[PDB]
Amino acid sequence: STIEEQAKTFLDKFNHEAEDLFYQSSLASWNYNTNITEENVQNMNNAGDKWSAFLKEQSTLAQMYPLQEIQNLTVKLQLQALQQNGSSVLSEDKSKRLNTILNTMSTIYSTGKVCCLLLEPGLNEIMANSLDYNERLWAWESWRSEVGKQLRPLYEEYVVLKNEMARANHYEDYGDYWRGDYEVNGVDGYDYSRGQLIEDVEHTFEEIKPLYEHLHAYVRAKLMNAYPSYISPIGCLPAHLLGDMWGRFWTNLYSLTVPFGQKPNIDVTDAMVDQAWDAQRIFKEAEKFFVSVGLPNMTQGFWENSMLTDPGNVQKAVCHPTAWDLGKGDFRILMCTKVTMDDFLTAHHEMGHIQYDMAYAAQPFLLRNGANEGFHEAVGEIMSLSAATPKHLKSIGLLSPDFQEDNETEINFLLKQALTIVGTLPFTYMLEKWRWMVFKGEIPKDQWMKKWWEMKREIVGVVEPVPHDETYCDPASLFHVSNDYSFIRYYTRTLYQFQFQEALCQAAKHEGPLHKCDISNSTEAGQKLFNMLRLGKSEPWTLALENVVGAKNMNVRPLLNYFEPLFTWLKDQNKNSFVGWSTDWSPY
Amino acid sequence: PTESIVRFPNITNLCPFGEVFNATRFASVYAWNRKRISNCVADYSVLYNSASFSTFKCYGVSPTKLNDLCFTNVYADSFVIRGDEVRQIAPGQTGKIADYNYKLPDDFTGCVIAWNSNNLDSKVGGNYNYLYRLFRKSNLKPFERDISTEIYQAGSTPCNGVEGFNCYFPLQSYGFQPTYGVGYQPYRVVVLSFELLHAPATVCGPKKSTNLVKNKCVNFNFNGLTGTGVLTESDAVRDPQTLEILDITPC
Ligand SMILES: *[C@@H]1O[C@H](CO)[C@@H](O)[C@H](O)[C@H]1NC(C)=O
Ligand SMILES: *[C@@H]1O[C@H](CO)[C@@H](O)[C@H](O)[C@H]1NC(C)=O
Ligand SMILES: *[C@@H]1O[C@H](CO)[C@@H](O)[C@H](O)[C@H]1NC(C)=O
Ligand SMILES: *[C@@H]1O[C@H](CO)[C@@H](O)[C@H](O)[C@H]1NC(C)=O
Ligand SMILES: *[C@@H]1O[C@H](CO)[C@@H](O)[C@H](O)[C@H]1NC(C)=O
Ligand SMILES: *[C@@H]1O[C@H](CO)[C@@H](O)[C@H](O)[C@H]1NC(C)=O
Ligand SMILES: *[C@@H]1O[C@H](CO)[C@@H](O)[C@H](O)[C@H]1NC(C)=O
Ligand SMILES: *[C@@H]1O[C@H](CO)[C@@H](O)[C@H](O)[C@H]1NC(C)=O
Ligand SMILES: [Zn+2]
């Protein structure tokens, strides 16, 4: 019969037994994670190999059906996802070499000694709490020299092999292959292109340049008080003084730069301990939040299957917080819950991931995912934004019934959150731009480090303390770069997060600033959210974005509207100090 | 209307509903098992009030009235399905179960009973003894049973009984584990169909028969049909206990 009908029959055969193999492998992984031992590793590896072999065989079988004949725009989506030939185009020797390179990179990064003083916690504590110039410089340079120097030729060979593999799949470069996620075709008025994402990021970054400039000037002025003779008024911040090994986040800088240090922050750890919360009541409160918004209950097996506290001394378990979607109606949470505010907020976040997983469970197997890579963390995170407000903590009995808030605490909270939200956008943008240019071939192999540090000086405003020759490979030191991970998800996550928060806050009829806003007891906000949640990947991410915000493309205006009082206060504070930086000045 | 007389056939045989409801193993949905029950008095009140059934829906008969009636035959069809497909066992529905496995006519006259069975037939590691038909050439006429395992062909080229490209095995196996969701947990289903004909009734509800009277206007109830009028030995009802034809004259 027609190719459409054969494709439909093939997909109906695949979805069954795909769900089965996926459930078995996921259950094996959960058994290993909750109970680590020698025997469980063999089950985990066996199930993983079985699932991988099944997926490869089904891809080879699905290669037969030509994609032009199908005209359903859902069967076509599932076929497009399934015919992802990918890395198998490489020769057997080339594939072996590529896997060897990746494994060597992961091995060398995982075990790195600068002595004895491993990366964690030996070097993180030095880089986060030393407060001494010489110690921080020594740790920074030693880690660079020990790790990044050894990864130069491996990274060069990785670049050439990955570029050739990506060109083999009818793509221009490997960067284009990465950007292929943000691409929707075939729908009139909703289409998008990979060449559109190279722009629409430069534009939004040009919009937030002044806010970052003011924050950078304020931090440098407040930081010259310490380190008196090593910072210049006009110039860049030295690279190792950013409170991290790479300067990805500025959170550790908070203790140095507080606007009003007299006022303590809101902290309810002692309130929790006084009432003796039992590490299960936290998830009860999270469920109460999500019910009051208008979203459904939790499944009956969630409470009995999942483990929500450390198993004990006899049974060892890795418990990095995680939300598990095992399939077949099975949802679980892996957390070592303690009575602290951070655990309360992260319980809210993971519960949000689970609530996202329940929505599109009715969709076929290939379409059970977020609309793109940024939609899923943003939905997870707006829940924590709503749960952190003083109003919400006041409604529960843990915060004091008679609490009076002054604008000093508003400024402290806004600055604390801004050192993390808008402090990492320039770094993400610069890193991904450098990787895109390297893969494209614009930067020759002899000019990698010069262009990297020129971009660091020009875009981020961060200057290196000691010069680096072409033997060094600084970007390869980061976990994501050497271990083959995409990085543009963290740029778009914040933008989507703030757009969703503004839409949900305006739908719930809130008045005043955006950062005091709360969406509990609002059924219409929950219904608007659930309309987008239930789509899964079936509809283009532009349409899923329109169903909540009302705009097709991502916008940065709500991010600035969130940070407006902080911006006004910063302008007032920096009316006297210099704003901007000079590229010429260097520490040496 | 001086008196009221009711006459049902004398049956003292308790009806074997335990052999159907309480069974060691239930059959797969694709090949269900049918049991005929007759010459029995059926107490439908305990069946309704057992209160352990997830679904108890009667179509075309009031659930309380059917306690006291007479039927020519009763058929009971039992199987095991998934939690989410119990809604497909009802007239006019469509899906994987209704199209190819168990199709009910539109003019249904019976009760569908379904209860959770996750304790009995679901174990860790999977229970692959319960199958269901997935591909079929055409839909099923009401109350039709197919047990064939012929290779289903979707493409143009025939395949000589071997799996491969465009050839599939029709039956696919339910996988049952105790950790599954409620939607995927097993459910045991029993469908009762009440058949009426002109033949003498055999299955009847519990009621005590009384002596008959003649030449007086009394209310009569024979085999579930009720009327009023003088009964005269010979618009004419054959009482079941003695097989005498009686004339009904309005009073
Ligand atoms: C963890 O695995 C060990 C395997 O030696 C087993 O003895 C133990 O019972 C497991 N813990 C459980 C099932 O809670
Ligand atoms: C595509 O096929 C599905 C069933 O597989 C159907 O529900 C849907 O309506 C079809 N799409 C269009 C546009 O007809
Ligand atoms: C997979 O390999 C085949 C080799 O014949 C090639 O034609 C096909 O385009 C590849 N799939 C891709 C690139 O998605
Ligand atoms: C479902 O949510 C409602 C809303 O408050 C609650 O009353 C009920 O107990 C919940 N049921 C389950 C099984 O979670
Ligand atoms: C905000 O805080 C500052 C801190 O000094 C205070 O002077 C001012 O009165 C507060 N309110 C406004 C509206 O500025
Ligand atoms: C939400 O509704 C509950 C229901 O009584 C109430 O206790 C709580 O104060 C409300 N909170 C907000 C923020 O409306
Ligand atoms: C079936 O077993 C239950 C459990 O013992 C019992 O109560 C019931 O009378 C039995 N028969 C029927 C028809 O349910
Ligand atoms: C029951 O009905 C039959 C009908 O033929 C009759 O012969 C019999 O006398 C009645 N009574 C008993 C106790 O069987
Ligand atoms: Zn998350």
Residue numbers in the entry:
A (entry chain D): 19 to 133, 141 to 613
B (entry chain A): 322 to 555, 574 to 590
Question: Any passages from the paper?
Answer:
The SARS-CoV-2 spike glycoprotein is the major surface antigen of the virus. Its function is to bind the host receptor ACE2 and mediate the subsequent membrane fusion required for cell entry. Here we have examined the structures and receptor-binding properties of spikes of the B.1.1.7 variant first described in Kent, United Kingdom (now termed Alpha)10,16–19 and the B.1.351 variant first described in South Africa (now termed Beta). Recently emerging variants of SARS-CoV-2 have acquired other substitutions in the spike including a number located at the monomer-monomer interfaces, at the receptor-binding site, and near the furin-cleavage site.
To test if the cleavage of the S1-S2 subunits is directly responsible for the greater stability of the trimeric ACE2-bound S1/S2 complex, we expressed the Alpha spike in the presence of a furin inhibitor, decanoyl-Arg-Val-Lys-Arg-chloromethylketone, which resulted in an almost completely uncleaved protein. Incubation of this uncleaved spike with ACE2 resulted in more than 50% of particles being monomeric S1-S2/ACE2. This conformation, like that of the Wuhan strain S1-S2/ACE2 complex, is incompatible with the trimeric structure. The data show a sixfold increase in binding strength for Alpha spike, and a twofold increase for Beta spike (compared to Wuhan) arising from the shared substitution N501Y in the RBD. The substitution of the asparagine at position 501 in Wuhan for a tyrosine residue in both Alpha & Beta variants leads to an increase in hydrophobic interactions between the aromatic ring of Y501(RBD) and the aromatic ring of Tyr-41(ACE2) and the aliphatic moiety of Lys-353(ACE2), in addition to a charged hydrogen bond between the phenolic hydroxyl of Tyr-501(RBD) and Lys-353(ACE2).
